[PDB]
Amino acid sequence: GRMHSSGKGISSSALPYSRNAPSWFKLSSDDVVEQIIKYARKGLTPSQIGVILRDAHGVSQAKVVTGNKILRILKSNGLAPEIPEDLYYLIKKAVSVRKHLEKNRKDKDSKFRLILIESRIHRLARYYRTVAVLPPNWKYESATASALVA
Amino acid sequence: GKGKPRGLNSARKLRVHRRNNRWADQAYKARLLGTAFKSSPFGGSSHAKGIVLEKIGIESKQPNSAIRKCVRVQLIKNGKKVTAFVPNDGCLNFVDENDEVLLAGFGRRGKAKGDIPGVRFKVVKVSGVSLLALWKEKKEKPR
Amino acid sequence: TRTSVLADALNAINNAEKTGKRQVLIRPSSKVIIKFLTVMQKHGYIGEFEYIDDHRSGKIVVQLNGRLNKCGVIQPRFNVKINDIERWTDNLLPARQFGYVILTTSAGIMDHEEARRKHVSGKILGFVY
RNA sequence: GAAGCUGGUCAAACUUGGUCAUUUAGAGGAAGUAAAAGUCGUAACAAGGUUUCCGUAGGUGAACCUGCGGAAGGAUCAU
RNA sequence: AGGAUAGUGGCCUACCAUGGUUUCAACGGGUAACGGGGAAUAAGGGUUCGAUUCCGGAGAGGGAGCCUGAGAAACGGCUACCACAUCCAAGGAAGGCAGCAGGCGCGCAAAUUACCCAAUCCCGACACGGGGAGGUAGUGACAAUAAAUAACGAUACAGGUUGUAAUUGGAAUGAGUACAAUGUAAAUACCUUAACGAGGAACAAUUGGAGGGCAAGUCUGGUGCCAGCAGCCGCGGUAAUUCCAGCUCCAAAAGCGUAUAUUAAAGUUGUUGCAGUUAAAAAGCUCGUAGUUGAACCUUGGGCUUGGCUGGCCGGUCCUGGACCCAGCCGAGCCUUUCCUUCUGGCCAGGACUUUUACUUUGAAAAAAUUAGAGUGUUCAAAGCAGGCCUUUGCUCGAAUAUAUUAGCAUGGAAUAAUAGAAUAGGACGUUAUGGUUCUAUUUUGUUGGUUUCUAGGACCAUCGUAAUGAUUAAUAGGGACGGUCGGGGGUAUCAGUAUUCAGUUGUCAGAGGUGAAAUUCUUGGAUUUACUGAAGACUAACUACUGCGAAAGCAUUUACCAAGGACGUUUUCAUUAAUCAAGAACGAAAGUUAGGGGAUCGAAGAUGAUCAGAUACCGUCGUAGUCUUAACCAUAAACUAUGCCGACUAGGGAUCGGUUGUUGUUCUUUUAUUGACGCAAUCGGCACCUUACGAGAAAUCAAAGUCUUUGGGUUCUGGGGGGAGUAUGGUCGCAAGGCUGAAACUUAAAGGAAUUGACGGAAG
RNA sequence: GGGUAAACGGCGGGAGUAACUAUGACUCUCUUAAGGUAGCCAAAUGCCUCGUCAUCUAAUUAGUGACGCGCAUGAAUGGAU
Ligand SMILES: [Mg+2]
Ligand SMILES: [Mg+2]
Ligand SMILES: [Mg+2]
Ligand SMILES: [Mg+2]
Ligand SMILES: [Mg+2]
Ligand SMILES: [Mg+2]
Ligand SMILES: [Mg+2]
Ligand SMILES: [Mg+2]
Ligand SMILES: [Mg+2]
Ligand SMILES: [Mg+2]
Ligand SMILES: [Mg+2]
Ligand SMILES: [Mg+2]
Ligand SMILES: [Mg+2]
Ligand SMILES: [Mg+2]
Ligand SMILES: [Mg+2]
Ligand SMILES: [Mg+2]
Ligand SMILES: [Mg+2]
Ligand SMILES: [Mg+2]
Ligand SMILES: [Mg+2]
Ligand SMILES: [Mg+2]
Ligand SMILES: [Mg+2]
Ligand SMILES: [Mg+2]
Ligand SMILES: [Mg+2]
Ligand SMILES: [Mg+2]
Ligand SMILES: [Mg+2]
Ligand SMILES: [Mg+2]
Ligand SMILES: [Mg+2]
Ligand SMILES: [Mg+2]
Ligand SMILES: [Mg+2]
Ligand SMILES: [Mg+2]
Ligand SMILES: [Mg+2]
Ligand SMILES: [Mg+2]
Ligand SMILES: [Mg+2]
Ligand SMILES: [Mg+2]
Ligand SMILES: [Mg+2]
Ligand SMILES: [Mg+2]
Ligand SMILES: [Mg+2]
Ligand SMILES: [Mg+2]
Ligand SMILES: [Mg+2]
Ligand SMILES: [Mg+2]
Ligand SMILES: [Mg+2]
Ligand SMILES: [Mg+2]
Ligand SMILES: [Mg+2]
Ligand SMILES: [Mg+2]
Ligand SMILES: [Mg+2]
Ligand SMILES: [Mg+2]
Ligand SMILES: [Mg+2]
Ligand SMILES: [Mg+2]
Ligand SMILES: [Mg+2]
Ligand SMILES: [Mg+2]
Ligand SMILES: [Mg+2]
Ligand SMILES: [Mg+2]
Ligand SMILES: [Mg+2]
Ligand SMILES: [Mg+2]
Ligand SMILES: [Mg+2]
Ligand SMILES: [Mg+2]
Ligand SMILES: [Mg+2]
Ligand SMILES: [Mg+2]
Ligand SMILES: [Mg+2]
Ligand SMILES: [Mg+2]
Ligand SMILES: [Mg+2]
Ligand SMILES: [Mg+2]
Ligand SMILES: [Mg+2]
Ligand SMILES: [Mg+2]
Ligand SMILES: [Mg+2]
Ligand SMILES: [Mg+2]
Ligand SMILES: [Mg+2]
Ligand SMILES: [Mg+2]
Ligand SMILES: [Mg+2]
Ligand SMILES: [Mg+2]
Ligand SMILES: [Mg+2]
Ligand SMILES: [Mg+2]
Ligand SMILES: [Mg+2]
Ligand SMILES: [Mg+2]
Ligand SMILES: [Mg+2]
Ligand SMILES: [Mg+2]
């Protein structure tokens, strides 16, 4: 494990065996959808919407209630971001590291980490182009990266 | 996984790797470089004729102590000069200067044999007559 | 990473059988693993085995009866013509009277003896004896 | 309708030049190996009498010595 | 577009575009390279060879150009040049053996300047001529087949009814020679066969060996570390089992030895099938493209009928044949919500559609010779493709069959491995759904031809109706988010600490320093020592550990800031995005290089005092680069765990660090909780450790160095006896030092690993 | 009395020695402030000298490449490129 490290941690979520809503759940398949859309318009990414749903509304999984995954619902309502969320957070991190590097030129560790982050961007961006999520001519530019994650 | 590819479509990697690694085999390397053609005094032949330049005694290596009686021969085919041992008790008297001798290896395939230092060939015939025939008085040297 | 779930399954069975255990847990399951086990079970090399559904690839618990000397995969799955089966059984099997080379043919997964009966050949998949 | 003539075309061959490739000479220089154990010492193997070795850099008849940083393949698996 | 060609084609020309090939190796170079059928060796897989009896190509000393002709860029045709070379009366003329034979040369290396068209076939106007094509003989130990060199008696003895060891006989025969006949075109030879042809049956078997490997002498003479032998280990210095000989014996024998190459042996090239901790060999460490390899999941089960073949039961027996019966093994065909294209004539023949592969079955193809193999008394055999029959004015088995194997072709199967589809529906069905836009036409009303609506077929366009309308899990793969953390992880500033040295003040007074002992050195001009004060650079003691962090190199005073990170927790999110990686990149201790700044301390070089035979060494005192820092270079270390990375499994135990989750006769907040510490349990991740050896290993040892002859989870790199040598040369990087890449000649029988006994040690007890 | 050579400057002689000879790695001996280091050379610096060897020519006191006990080469009186 750990594409860009030697770690071997196994921590992750363990979905329950049951694929049905809990008996105590009373919200309808609709009320969750307007709840999802309401948070998506506030600027939350699909990861944060799911966190708010289980933390404060009892929505264990949006799929077991609504029938569709959170990003699938946003794409059906025209709220899907242009850049996929995980690629967006990688580019934002690379922008932050690159901005720190120009003021700390002797930080050779940050130079090493930037290569890891940018290599991780290119591998993920390459995947998104083959599944036609990004345009075939989409390319990550270090100079113009700040515009995408503005 | 034994350090070599096993995939069904990895024949190129396996074929190239073997080709690269056979160069570590000196028998294979000498055959393709043509070292016998370029470097060997005989030029790859089993035998070679030459002219006796001088009769020379060569001291054997330790722990042996003897005078190995060889000759200096200049090969006709390429003009190279080699040292050839003259085998058996008293066969040096059958070999004279400016005689034509047929040479052959010691059987170690380019290496020196026994305690004889730097000698890789032996005399087979002199003046067109077998050295063994002369030694056993089967024939006489034509002179 | 995990490149062959059949190799992992058979390796786990071999390690459990060598230590005298009468049961082994296999993860993950697959169709190829189950059909490979069915061939072993039909010839008596294993007992009853159990599939556990976890809404994922699955798990298997196999009962071992101590008759299994060795089971293994052949990686890669070489293409095997009918005339090539003899060479494989000579290299892989301990004798000409017992042991089986498992093939995947378009007629299904089967041992080399059944493949000769219905005159089919495919890719080699493993062995058992 | 012959010799011959004009212009083309294919173009051998030669001369010069370049380049490639293969052999080969050479004052002198610097090595390696074999032979014998010739001269000088004793660097290594024991804590080999300054533990040894690695990288690097100087020095020195020669092995080698010294500095800096490593290793134990240490002469300590330990207070 | 043309020209040219027999014709296609940048084949050539004109004009116009800027294309074409390539790490899946283009292009260039080498080949002691014609390709293939095939050959050698071979358990299998392979390795090596193929100039050479057949097929294809190319050439006729080297090029080039042509004539004739259906066909040639022909060479036993021509023209020219180059190189060789012949005759000449000096004016000229004539050449092409890589055809047959022959000569020279070259070399280790290869035959007669013979007979014939009789056979096999070819050519011609052809029943007739010609053929160094071809056949026949000569030379021929290239290879291959069969196969003599003696057999049998009697005595005499030895011997356990008969095997020999000797001296005594009569038989047998072909090697050879030959009448003759056969053979043949004519001969030779073979095959037959009169007469001749064997006792030492001299009609005389050789080649290598006799220490081991390796079968067979401790016999005799000679030499004396000489001569010589000896593939290797070794033998030989006065009783040599090894040399030179005699005897005897061994092995193979018309053959045996030697040299070189090659194959097996070699699992020492390893796909099957090697090795990489220490024997050779894991890149210093990460990233990364090609390449290789990649979790799981989609028609399963059930029922009925039926065909065939195996065993028998039946038995049905002259080993053999049938339903019934049992099981077993293959094929089917229907039904289960049901894939299996669709229409016309009506399973065969005539139309319309079709996700792409890989794989495997069957078929056809892969020339003959060769290989394997069936038949067949060439006297046997190697071979050959003949042959066999009661003896024939003819009858008659044959000349099989397999294998080829990549590519292509046809075909069945749908596991395994890929590939495509309906997500902004631009989706599917409506066979006769409703209209609309078009396009083509057989057929007329037959007296022939015009006229555009019905018509049929597309092909589209809209509407409507059908439908269960359409999105696989979320992998103890990965990525991302989030929540409390946790680190001596990094950078930039900043703040300590004593110490060292140097200086200033002070105090006394004779030494101080340094060593095994001294000396160099500093000292009444006050050294060393003492207190206070100050300045410089380094460095971060103790705490500090079988503890932490980092990709590695490395990282240890405080605080602030900057951007990272692992693990843990998660009923968050995405869904294969991944693993390892030629090429290509980032970082990379120390030393070293360039330029500034700093230069306390140590300290290469250097200088010096000792020691010593000598020490320009160890030891002592000084000391320059350097040590520190900023900008750049360098890219190497025993860069080590001498142990690649990813994944799974196999055994017990106690500690420990980080996170999380449950709980105390414990201390403390604060008086208690929601304090913190500690204690007890679980768990995930780490750094390690202890025991055992199921297991591994040559062992040392190893929880991986195991799951490896019971050999296959994925993948990268490296090694092939020791030296020469990480050398030479070329390239490339570097300012240089040097780095990376990297041979060969030659030389050598060991070098080496781990362990055992001993001996020794200026090691311990 | 101490420091200072990118201050002026300076930077040694004599014998013996290796299973032929030659040389002298080595040793002895006198002696300095230190005894010429890295380099370079019959050089624009070498007398002997037209040094010796090689190359260039038919022939070279010239040229170039080597050699080096160098009358009297040599390191910011800068050395070698
Ligand atoms: Mg894991
Ligand atoms: Mg993460
Ligand atoms: Mg990776
Ligand atoms: Mg190598
Ligand atoms: Mg060339
Ligand atoms: Mg010593
Ligand atoms: Mg000493
Ligand atoms: Mg020492
Ligand atoms: Mg020193
Ligand atoms: Mg045209
Ligand atoms: Mg054209
Ligand atoms: Mg043109
Ligand atoms: Mg060939
Ligand atoms: Mg050729
Ligand atoms: Mg050929
Ligand atoms: Mg040839
Ligand atoms: Mg031919
Ligand atoms: Mg010729
Ligand atoms: Mg010609
Ligand atoms: Mg011609
Ligand atoms: Mg001719
Ligand atoms: Mg001809
Ligand atoms: Mg002739
Ligand atoms: Mg013969
Ligand atoms: Mg005879
Ligand atoms: Mg004999
Ligand atoms: Mg002999
Ligand atoms: Mg003898
Ligand atoms: Mg024997
Ligand atoms: Mg021999
Ligand atoms: Mg020995
Ligand atoms: Mg004697
Ligand atoms: Mg004797
Ligand atoms: Mg071999
Ligand atoms: Mg090996
Ligand atoms: Mg070693
Ligand atoms: Mg090693
Ligand atoms: Mg490593
Ligand atoms: Mg799969
Ligand atoms: Mg019909
Ligand atoms: Mg054939
Ligand atoms: Mg085929
Ligand atoms: Mg998951
Ligand atoms: Mg976080
Ligand atoms: Mg805590
Ligand atoms: Mg700590
Ligand atoms: Mg770590
Ligand atoms: Mg690389
Ligand atoms: Mg560095
Ligand atoms: Mg400086
Ligand atoms: Mg200093
Ligand atoms: Mg001294
Ligand atoms: Mg010194
Ligand atoms: Mg000091
Ligand atoms: Mg510096
Ligand atoms: Mg290295
Ligand atoms: Mg280490
Ligand atoms: Mg290493
Ligand atoms: Mg690696
Ligand atoms: Mg592992
Ligand atoms: Mg804990
Ligand atoms: Mg064992
Ligand atoms: Mg252990
Ligand atoms: Mg370990
Ligand atoms: Mg080697
Ligand atoms: Mg020896
Ligand atoms: Mg040892
Ligand atoms: Mg000098
Ligand atoms: Mg001079
Ligand atoms: Mg001059
Ligand atoms: Mg002149
Ligand atoms: Mg001159
Ligand atoms: Mg000169
Ligand atoms: Mg001077
Ligand atoms: Mg100076
Ligand atoms: Mg001067």
Side-chain angles (χ1 to χ4, degrees):
Chain A
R2 301 290 78 76
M3 163 201 290
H4 280 149
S5 186
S6 46
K8 306 273 159 64
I10 74 159
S11 80
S12 88
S13 294
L15 281 72
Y17 181 85
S18 177
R19 280 167 183 168
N20 307 136
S23 61
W24 49 259
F25 198 69
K26 297 316 188 314
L27 296 185
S28 80
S29 168
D30 296 20
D31 313 323
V32 186
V33 169
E34 290 85 5
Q35 213 72 29
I36 287 174
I37 289 169
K38 192 193 68 63
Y39 283 116
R41 293 179 181 176
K42 302 201 182 318
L44 300 199
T45 66
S47 305
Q48 322 190 270
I49 296 167
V51 164
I52 301 299
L53 281 183
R54 62 175 173 85
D55 272 359
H57 301 276
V59 180
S60 64
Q61 289 274 124
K63 183 184 171 58
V64 299
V65 176
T66 76
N68 309 99
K69 295 180 131 210
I70 288 186
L71 180 66
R72 190 181 300 278
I73 298 172
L74 296 197
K75 202 207 179 190
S76 290
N77 300 290
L79 291 160
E82 293 83 3
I83 306 290
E85 154 190 350
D86 49 351
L87 183 58
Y88 165 87
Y89 279 108
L90 275 173
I91 297 175
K92 158 186 272 192
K93 190 189 281 306
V95 166
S96 185
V97 171
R98 196 176 279 280
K99 182 174 72 68
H100 160 92
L101 261 184
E102 65 199 359
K103 296 183 290 294
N104 307 261
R105 180 65 65 193
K106 307 197 71 181
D107 199 344
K108 281 149 180 172
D109 180 34
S110 285
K111 179 172 180 183
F112 178 82
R113 300 297 160 180
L114 184 60
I115 300 171
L116 295 190
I117 296 161
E118 296 210 297
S119 298
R120 188 180 299 114
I121 285 163
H122 290 304
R123 288 160 76 144
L124 183 62
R126 185 177 65 246
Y127 155 73
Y128 278 133
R129 280 192 317 258
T130 68
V131 296
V133 168
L134 291 177
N137 54 276
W138 197 94
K139 190 186 260 202
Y140 163 77
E141 294 293 328
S142 67
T144 79
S146 300
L148 324 174
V149 301
Chain B
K2 263 179 181 172
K4 51 182 157 187
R6 277 209 195 106
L8 199 64
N9 294 343
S10 63
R12 173 177 287 111
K13 182 67 180 294
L14 291 173
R15 175 174 47 90
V16 168
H17 187 251
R18 175 61 47 236
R19 178 218 290 162
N20 288 331
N21 280 270
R22 294 182 68 188
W23 287 107
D25 185 332
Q26 45 175 267
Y28 169 87
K29 183 164 213 176
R31 170 156 43 85
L32 281 72
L33 294 192
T35 61
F37 201 71
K38 317 281 194 55
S39 296
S40 184
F42 278 15
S45 304
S46 53
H47 297 65
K49 278 177 197 175
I51 304 298
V52 176
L53 298 179
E54 58 175 311
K55 294 188 286 185
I56 173 177
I58 297 169
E59 293 179 353
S60 60
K61 282 190 256 181
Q62 284 329 299
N64 284 0
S65 175
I67 297 298
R68 304 294 168 219
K69 294 181 177 66
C70 313
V71 286
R72 288 293 295 184
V73 182
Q74 185 167 38
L75 297 183
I76 297 168
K77 71 196 293 182
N78 47 20
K80 294 180 177 176
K81 285 167 194 167
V82 303
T83 313
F85 181 57
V86 183
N88 295 327
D89 208 328
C91 292
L92 188 62
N93 306 326
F94 293 125
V95 181
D96 292 331
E97 271 91 347
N98 312 306
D99 290 332
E100 184 178 1
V101 285
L102 177 74
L103 310 186
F106 284 163
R108 289 207 73 204
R109 302 174 302 101
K111 313 182 219 78
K113 154 185 165 308
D115 53 27
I116 300 169
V119 174
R120 318 185 264 166
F121 313 98
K122 72 179 169 185
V123 167
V124 173
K125 293 163 72 166
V126 64
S127 293
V129 173
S130 166
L131 209 55
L132 200 71
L134 292 177
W135 197 56
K136 304 163 103 81
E137 291 84 4
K138 285 169 166 287
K139 296 191 181 55
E140 293 83 3
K141 197 173 158 180
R143 190 74 268 158
Chain C
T1 44
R2 204 185 287 264
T3 66
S4 169
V5 303
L6 185 66
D8 281 1
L10 300 193
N11 179 262
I13 295 179
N14 273 327
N15 289 355
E17 185 66 295
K18 292 181 181 179
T19 56
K21 302 180 186 299
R22 312 285 305 287
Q23 69 283 303
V24 63
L25 172 81
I26 288 173
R27 179 195 69 96
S29 178
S30 66
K31 293 186 287 184
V32 176
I33 291 173
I34 288 182
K35 290 193 161 306
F36 199 102
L37 289 176
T38 303
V39 178
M40 293 162 80
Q41 181 184 65
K42 182 175 73 175
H43 294 303
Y45 286 104
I46 60 171
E48 180 210 278
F49 60 97
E50 185 68 26
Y51 170 84
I52 305 156
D53 168 47
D54 51 353
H55 287 161
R56 284 154 186 97
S57 311
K59 294 185 189 181
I60 300 179
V61 171
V62 188
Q63 302 298 318
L64 316 163
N65 49 32
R67 299 158 160 179
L68 178 56
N69 283 292
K70 192 177 208 298
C71 62
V73 298
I74 295 299
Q75 292 296 110
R77 311 184 166 169
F78 296 102
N79 309 301
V80 178
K81 303 191 189 300
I82 295 171
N83 291 319
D84 295 351
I85 301 187
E86 178 77 23
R87 184 185 61 76
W88 278 108
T89 60
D90 288 0
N91 299 341
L92 303 181
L93 300 185
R96 320 191 76 242
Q97 296 99 6
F98 67 97
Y100 296 108
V101 168
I102 318 294
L103 312 171
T104 185
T105 80
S106 72
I109 288 175
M110 64 184 73
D111 51 285
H112 82 279
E113 279 194 22
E114 161 159 7
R116 270 161 186 173
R117 265 181 264 127
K118 41 195 57 171
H119 200 74
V120 297
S121 197
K123 299 163 176 297
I124 186 173
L125 185 63
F127 58 91
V128 64
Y129 52 85

